[PDB]
Symmetry: C2
Subunit: 264 residues, 2 copies
């Protein structure tokens, strides 16, 4: 039973916890399905909880994070209003999953108060950030990374801090967060370079800037190597999460080998 | 001076919310939108009426304002008909909500009380709202059932939070009972108002009333039941007597101002009458047939229409004179 077996079971367990919850609160089949298809979002909590030694606590935190992350994803579906799903269901399920997550996370945190501390702390930076992102679209790598740092990095960094706050001891809280923020940007670039064709995205989209020449391929390669570097470092801080090393390489190499060639 | 406290409270909450909206990147339009939520911003003052420490009362009142508004922005976002920017709506919605959670948890008796309360009937509230829009109501019973989740349960939770964060002397169950009953009185008022302000029709109480699907007298009985429920909760020790005029104010407004717009010609249930014996017979006439009426000592004498250019006559003790007849006296 290797790490992949733990990852696959964590993902399935998070998916089930989420769908059960969407369904008991009125979610339509289409919404339950939409929810079941957010694969990475359901998997990411497993990486964030890699520093948690108790297997039972880790599964509990993992699925509580999955509930809020999916919740935020639905809130995001609600603002783009482009999924064809019923906005009432989207809004209601979004609220329901979020409140259940607060309940679950607070019941696992050493200090229940730590949960609302973390969520409030850079709430302005994350929310005001998302507004600016959608207002002024990016025109170069500097502007892109800046925006991605809020809806991507700050977004995941928060769940990083929560996983540390609800994971018991032996948790290097700042490294868990460092990890999530660097990893979040690697995957945000991935999404950008996948969503160009799957969604027909243009304005502010990194793939678009790449093709229109506003951004150089080498710069993009450098950014990825920088993020890889930052992620590997974060997981080497004591106590350390060696399990995440292959994960960092997996997602980074994929953007390099599979996705970048599609734009250059 | 409770009126001055109530007004100040609303302004204080307005201030706290708008600054918060502004600090997050909310546009002037959105800021104005939330500043216009008058009753939403005032309601927290009613919910914290049992809070003895003024400084704590103000802190709780504004934290509640924050979340109540946020939920209102969430609702604006699902209807997507305000013309406001969906991104700002979603982001400000989340930001205010997260701020409210932080403020409330800081005032709570117990660390888990805020999230316990929000989780408790979260499914009831959320699936409740989904079903409200999924199946429009077709009678008073159905209207009331839907209204009990997005109105009563909705405000009931903030009633529970006011009690949880308002230190000692809070009759948790009563604060919430008030919130749930008052929320429904307000919800009926919105329906009877928004019929014209918004052009709302499906599942709308005023529409059900005009359509004939719901009877005026039943609406009156419900409002009376709700006034009674609210008054009782407010009477429970330690008591919040200051809320009494408030309860009557809102209930009477629905009865006096709003209801008549949907019933018209005295939809006050049954056509009132006057019973009397005349020339040895049992007689009863509808106030609608009565022409002239005057007093002679404690007796009320009057005439009326019997059918055609025909005119009736009669006299009854004032003790047996219906309210309507007695009013016709003053009005004559």
């Amino acid at each position: 039973v290797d790490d992949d077996d733990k990852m696959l079971a964590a993902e399935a367990a998070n998916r089930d916890h989420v769908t059960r919850c969407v369904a008991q609160t009125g979610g339509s089949p289409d919404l339950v399905a939409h929810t079941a298809a957010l694969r990475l979002y359901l998997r990411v909590p497993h990486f964030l909880t890699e520093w948690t030694t108790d297997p039972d606590r880790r599964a509990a935190v993992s699925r509580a994070l999955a509930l809020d992350i999916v919740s935020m994803k639905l809130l995001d579906d609600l603002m783009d209003d482009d999924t064809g799903l019923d906005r009432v269901e989207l809004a209601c399920v979004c609220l329901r999953l979020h409140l259940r997550a607060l309940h679950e996370l607070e019941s696992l945190a050493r200090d229940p108060k730590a949960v609302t501390d973390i969520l409030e702390q850079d709430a302005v930076h994350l929310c005001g950030g998302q507004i600016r992102t959608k207002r002024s679209r990016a025109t170069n790598l500097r502007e892109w990374r800046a925006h991605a740092s809020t809806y991507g990095s700050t977004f995941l960094g928060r769940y990083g801090a929560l996983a540390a706050a609800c994971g018991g001891e032996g948790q290097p809280a700042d490294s868990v967060r460092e990890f999530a923020e660097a990893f979040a940007m690697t995957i945000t670039m991935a999404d950008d370079l996948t969503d160009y064709d799957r969604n027909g995205e243009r304005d502010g989209n990194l793939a678009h800037l790449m093709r229109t020449g506003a951004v150089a391929g080498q710069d993009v390669v450098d950014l990825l190597e920088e993020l890889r570097g930052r992620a590997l470092a974060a997981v080497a801080a004591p106590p350390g999460a060696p399990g995440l090393v292959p994960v960092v390489h997996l997602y980074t190499d994929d953007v390099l080998v599979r996705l970048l060639p599609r734009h250059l």
